[PDB]
Amino acid sequence: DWEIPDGQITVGQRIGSGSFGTVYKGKWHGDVAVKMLNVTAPTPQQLQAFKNEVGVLRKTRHVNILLFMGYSTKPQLAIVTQWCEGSSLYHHLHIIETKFEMIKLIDIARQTAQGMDYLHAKSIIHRDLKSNNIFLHEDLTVKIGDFGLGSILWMAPEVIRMQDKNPYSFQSDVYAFGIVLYELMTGQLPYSNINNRDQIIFMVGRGYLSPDLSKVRSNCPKAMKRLMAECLKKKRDERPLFPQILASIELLARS
Amino acid sequence: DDWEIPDGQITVGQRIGSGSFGTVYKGKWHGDVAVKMLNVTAPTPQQLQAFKNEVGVLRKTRHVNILLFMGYSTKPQLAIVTQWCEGSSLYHHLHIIETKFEMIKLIDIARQTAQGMDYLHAKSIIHRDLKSNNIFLHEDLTVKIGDFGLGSILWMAPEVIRMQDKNPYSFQSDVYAFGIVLYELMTGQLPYSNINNRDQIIFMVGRGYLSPDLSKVRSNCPKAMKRLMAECLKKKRDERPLFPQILASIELLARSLP
Ligand SMILES: N#Cc1c(Oc2ccc(F)c(NC(=O)Nc3cccc(C(F)(F)F)c3)c2)ccc2nc(NC(=O)C3CC3)sc12
Ligand SMILES: N#Cc1c(Oc2ccc(F)c(NC(=O)Nc3cccc(C(F)(F)F)c3)c2)ccc2nc(NC(=O)C3CC3)sc12
């Protein structure tokens, strides 16, 4: 059991509202992050969406995943995780424009791949891997979570198109990671020279548009570009699963 | 939930420490991990039981200041997997390589150690064996309380030494061990450094003739901290404060220095 008895959680300052509920910095045995629905009465579809997020988070125990600590039913539906420190990768790369050395860019890539490999082993498709959902905790450990405060740049073509009810795959996560690798090695978002959204969508969908890999920094290894392209392949089952990605990196890493 | 790990997944690598209880290795399971194994083939009822008790405890913990339990494995050999800490144990820092942390940092380490203990006690878990070695200073920044043993006398409270009941262990018994760690932090030494005989230490602490020497604390150790130590080291269980109160005391203390 991971219920947290009513009365123990202190909710602090508001951080933002996602699709689910609202995230606050709180205090429960130290600094913790609390995501809660701000409603009097939750509908059975929300009651369920909560149970699934909790069902998923309780299955995780890994240094590179947001540490889930517990939930609360009364007074509000609420999920407590660890309170991260620093800022997201999205922030680092495109807002404050941190200038990481390549050795760290690679190490970040590795830790991200590490968490993703773990989730996939546990049969969890993330469905929204992107730099903003990646926190650089204490500026050195990667923590994958859901931090949304929609996100098409990380979507694979088959996802874009949406032929199926469900198009999500281990492979769809891999593509997203391939875009995250783009962000790392370019320091930039993709398709920066196109100002129209629907076109970006159409084209990526139709395989007319793909990330401009020449834009990567020059000290970026040739194995790492090669890996980048493999995760970005427009055809699903040509993309490698994470065990192979993790190996590819570890190889070049020790050289 | 089911935290069993499938067979042939874990790669036990270099050995890290032996001991007649079991063995700990650096390993590979979704990155770097620590792997405590039992190093016989056929485990006894007493070994199997004690294994289920350690898992039983660990899986009830989820907190930054607690060593992250990741999974267990029965086939082929019994094994427990935790996160791999990069860094050194706090004992190792203070007594082996003698790291000199600045005072604000020492207090932080105490704040976290207390933070995680508060957690455990609020989850009705008594460590029984808190000490500098069982505290890892992960990545030189976060504290991780674990149990790296395979008694440890300097941290036992008088009533624990006198073997009053079968269970002299208490939240307070743990608080006394914490007080000894604070002493390690603020002096950088183990207590009773001028005594070389173990029976005498036991006998004396048991009888109340020997208290840790608080004159030895660093000159810049605050008065409030020094008080808190003596409060934690009280010879009588009941006069020892519990961790909510401790943490609170530390946190008031903390804001009055950069
Ligand atoms: N926002 C936020 C946030 C955050 O988001 C949450 C909070 C609670 C949740 F349940 C969740 N929930 C999840 O992550 N759920 C989830 C769902 C599906 C899959 C996964 C998983 F594990 F696969 F990633 C997680 C997220 C957690 C920590 C945190 N720290 C921050 N620090 C700062 O803002 C500044 C440095 C001072 S912000 C922040
Ligand atoms: N030794 C070791 C070790 C370690 O000990 C373990 C391993 C597995 C366990 F199950 C356990 N078991 C427990 O922690 N059990 C336990 C039992 C009761 C209560 C508690 C708790 F969580 F309350 F503290 C834990 C311990 C874990 C990580 C680790 N990392 C190290 N890194 C280095 O030394 C490198 C130089 C940088 S060493 C190391």
From Swiss-Prot, chain B:
Cross-link Glycyl lysine isopeptide (Lys-Gly) (interchain with G-Cter in ubiquitin) placement: 131
Positions bound to ATP: 16-24, 36
Tissue-wise expression: Brain and testis.
Outcome of mutating residue 36 to S: Reduces kinase activity with MAP2K1
Subcellular location: Nucleus; Cytoplasm; Cell membrane
Active-site residues, Swiss-Prot/TrEMBL: 129
PTM remark: Methylation at Arg-207 decreases stability and kinase activity. Ubiquitinated by RNF149; which leads to proteasomal degradation. Polyubiquitinated at Lys-131 in response to EGF.
Reported impact of residue 148 to L: In CFC1; also found in colon cancer
Outcome after substituting residue 22 to A: In NHL; also in a lung adenocarcinoma sample; somatic mutation; elevated kinase activity; efficiently induces cell transformation
Effect of residue 139 to K: In ovarian cancer
Family: Belongs to the protein kinase superfamily. TKL Ser/Thr protein kinase family. RAF subfamily.
Reported disease: Defects in BRAF are found in a wide range of cancers.
Protein name as catalogued: Serine/threonine-protein kinase B-raf
Organism: Homo sapiens
Gene this chain is encoded by: BRAF
Residue range from the parent sequence: 448 to 722 of 766
